[PDB]
Ligand binder design. Structure first.
Ligand SMILES: OC[C@H]1O[C@@](CO)(O[C@H]2O[C@H](CO)[C@@H](O)[C@H](O)[C@H]2O)[C@@H](O)[C@@H]1O
Lengths: 215, 215
């Protein structure tokens, strides 16, 4: 429980605000940083990049992503949720309002919903945290009705500037930690990252096959 | 005490003919596959992808790469060597006789040599081990005079089919382990991979800066 050597190493590496937790491997800690998950030996000497896999069972399990799912769920109050009336599936989408495929996706929201697919958005500026995309998405996420603000944004209408204590930079960072490198990126209940756009029909097909629904 | 737990894991993951070596981390083994390096716990339970860094010093060291450099040097007798008469630098080049840039490089061999740069070749068919590029380069490397056969092949001469005691499968696999994305790919004495072509003048400047010639 003395993460001092690791912290000293992180300082020399100039990594700040990293979260150091144990890993399933003895003598190695899970280090979650703003640009990825690291695995570092307790002595501070050795460093591997994520993800960590558990290949003990019949099928490999992505340990790192299972851990990140809990980080994903602590953001639920910051999600813009488009709920399907009768809900068969729930996906979490990292989206960028400036992205043509994210637009294409969003334009069909009523169709995804009609097919039982609930969509939950987190902000992910492809061009990073200092982009206009980031600022405009910050305003959207600060509105009392995020859904309306998001809809109007996607309809190209002007975005009123707003700021509040909600920090969507944490959304971007979680996305980087999941290994996401573009939008839209789908997070399944089961932990899998599915890059890229899929229309309502393809999405449902993929979800019914890969995403167990006990129902 | 043996590698049975790891090997059983390698079997489940359909990883054939891997080589299990030590690692600096207790309870972790370096596993060299045909496609790269893996780090796997002794119990076969966990798996991390390389590269492994040693970050104990003033500067990070890529431990994985230092291990691949050891295999690189083990292939020195398999290299086609164009030695500079007054040697100041030595580079190792993964090359494909079908690659326009490797040809552009190879045509200037006298100019690299005159600048004191010795070039050593390993074969890297971009189209894999089942391609015609593999057959021709296997043929080249099998000749009593690899240098002449390589020259004549770059002069677009018909390469006579030829076999011997070895093929070039190990060259390709090493290149893949280094993570090489295309040709030519340059390996420095210091383990660094420098992708792509550089003319003799740019090459020398690059070496004099990054690869101290202590002599
Ligand atoms: O079968 C080739 C095999 O032989 C070695 C020596 O063990 O190299 C010799 O044969 C080569 C191919 O004809 C020559 O180019 C080389 O000069 C000669 O020493 C190995 O290097 C090679 O794998």
């Amino acid at each position: 429980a003395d993460d001092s050597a690791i912290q000293q190493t992180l300082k020399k590496l100039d990594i700040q605000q990293a979260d150091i937790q144990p890993s399933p491997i003895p003598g190695i800690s899970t280090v979650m940083t703003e640009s990825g998950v690291l695995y570092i030996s307790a002595d501070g000497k050795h460093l591997l990049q994520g993800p960590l896999y558990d290949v003990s069972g019949d099928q490999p399990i992505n340990v790192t992503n299972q851990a990140l799912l809990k980080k994903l769920e602590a953001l639920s109050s910051e999600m813009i949720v488009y709920k399907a009336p009768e809900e068969k599936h729930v996906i979490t989408v990292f989206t960028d309002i400036t992205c043509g495929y994210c637009r294409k996706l969003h334009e069909q929201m009523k169709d995804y919903n009609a097919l039982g697919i609930t969509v939950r958005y987190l902000a992910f500026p492809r061009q990073g945290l200092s982009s206009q995309a980031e600022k405009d998405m910050r305003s959207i996420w600060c509105m009392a009705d995020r859904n309306k603000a998001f809809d109007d944004a996607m309809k190209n209408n002007d975005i009123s500037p707003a700021t509040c204590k909600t920090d969507i930079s944490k959304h971007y960072q979680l996305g980087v930690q999941f290994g996401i490198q573009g939008t839209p990126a789908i997070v399944l209940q089961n932990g899998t990252i599915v890059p890229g756009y899929q229309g309502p029909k393809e999405m449902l097909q993929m979800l019914n096959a890969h995403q167990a629904s006990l129902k």
